[PDB]
């Protein structure tokens, strides 16, 4: 086992939360109580669709023009990016830092496979960017990561939380960790180098 | 080499201590809320009782069992501890101290620390767990080439008076007896510890 390739969302950064908060603050500004339950139902729902559900709870889907709903949605996003900009190292997902440590302490190459154009900026904001020896600039965005790390895909694990990403990792011929994947953990804290080793050892045998 | 109090440094058990008391309050049927909890940070029991208007209701030996039941309840709830309750910089800080065979110690007042450390999944990373300013010494015994970290004025001075370098986690006057003061557990990394230590080390000689 030579490299571990990370994605950003739900793996390194708690983007999900930040989307929750985004949605919430807009709702304050629009005078509608938001909460996580509503949030959890609006998981995987169109941005425009989510907003309509919030508006319907507030009996306000008729109060607002399309134009205004557009701006609504625009602000949510600026709020979100704004929130993402104030990231600190206390915002690092549990288990992650310690995991990096082990991988380095053990001389495993570490990579990043995120679609975000601000990744380097973020890894820096999180104080872990020195840990990465390859960051891909925005499938096989994963095959690129392995090229950069100078290692076979067969010898890499990629950690991910998105349906699609896991497809990509798999198609890219790597051991895929989900957080339809080769190994699945509940929360990031569950990721130890030790579990990774063991499960990865088994993975390659079953082929 | 480096020593930790538990609560406020490695993890936060506040919620559990709270619940623990609230179950007792309920058993006595006396009003109890998080506001009180904070304010009351045995004297405590009397307080809720005096407040509850039941200052005469309980003996002392009964009163003692009311406490025994509480340590027992608490000791249970902390079962709900996962490594997810480890504090920001900690886990990594720990894997590093290990990598560089710096030694890892727990000098906590907590009576349940061993179970706590095991739920956090880090318990193996330690080598001295204290068992009840003597404390951090006892820990060292388990020694001026020593670091320790606290989040309270009390712990802080107990450390310096133990003659080591004292790293404070928090902010304010509660912090002004500390060698180092990071505003949160994340800020504290094996690097920063080192850089600020060799500077303390020198100022000795």
Curated annotation (Swiss-Prot), chain B:
InterPro entries: B-phosphoglucomutase_hydrolase, Beta-PGM, HAD-like_sf, HAD-SF_hydro_IA, HAD_sf, PGP-like_dom2. The keyword rRNA processing does not apply. Its cofactor is Mg(2+). Binds 1 magnesium ion per subunit. One of its GO terms (biological process) is carbohydrate metabolic process. Its EC number is 5.4.2.6. Mg(2+) binds at residues 5, 7, 151. Disulfide bonds: none annotated. One of its GO terms (molecular function) is beta-phosphoglucomutase activity. Beta-D-glucose 6-phosphate binds at residues 7, 110-112. The keyword Repeat does not apply. It catalyses: beta-D-glucose 1-phosphate = beta-D-glucose 6-phosphate. The modification 4-aspartylphosphate is found at residue 5. Keywords: Carbohydrate metabolism, Cytoplasm, Isomerase, Magnesium, Metal-binding, Phosphoprotein. The catalysis proceeds via a phosphoenzyme formed by reaction of an active-site nucleophile with the cofactor glucose 1,6-diphosphate (G1,6-diP). The phosphorylated mutase binds either G1P or G6P and transfers the phosphoryl group to the C(6)OH or C(1)OH, respectively. NCBIfam families: bPGM, HAD-SF-IA-v3, PGMB-YQAB-SF. Catalyzes the interconversion of D-glucose 1-phosphate (G1P) and D-glucose 6-phosphate (G6P), forming beta-D-glucose 1,6-(bis)phosphate (beta-G16P) as an intermediate. Homodimer. This is Beta-phosphoglucomutase.
């Amino acid at each position: 086992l030579k490299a571990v390739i990370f994605d950003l969302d739900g793996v390194i950064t708690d983007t999900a939360e930040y989307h929750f908060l985004a949605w919430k603050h807009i709702a304050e500004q629009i005078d509608i109580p938001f909460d996580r339950d509503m949030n959890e139902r609006l998981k995987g729902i169109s941005r425009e669709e989510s907003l309509e559900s919030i508006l319907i709870f507030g009996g306000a889907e008729t109060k607002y023009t399309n134009a205004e709903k557009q701006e609504l949605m625009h602000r949510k996003n600026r709020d979100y990016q704004m929130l993402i900009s104030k990231l600190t190292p206390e915002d690092l997902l549990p288990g992650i830092g310690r995991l990096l440590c082990q991988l380095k302490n053990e001389n495993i190459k570490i990579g990043l496979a995120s679609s975000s154009r601000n990744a380097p900026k973020i890894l820096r904001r999180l104080a872990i960017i020195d840990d990465f020896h390859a960051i891909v600039d925005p499938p096989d965005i994963f095959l690129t990561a392995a090229a950069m790390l100078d290692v076979s895909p067969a010898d890499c694990a990629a950690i991910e939380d998105a349906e699609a990403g896991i497809s990509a990792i798999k198609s890219a011929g790597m051991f895929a960790v989900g957080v339809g994947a080769d190994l699945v953990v509940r929360q990031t804290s569950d990721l130890t180098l030790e579990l990774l080793h063991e499960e990865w050892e088994q993975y390659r045998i079953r082929e």
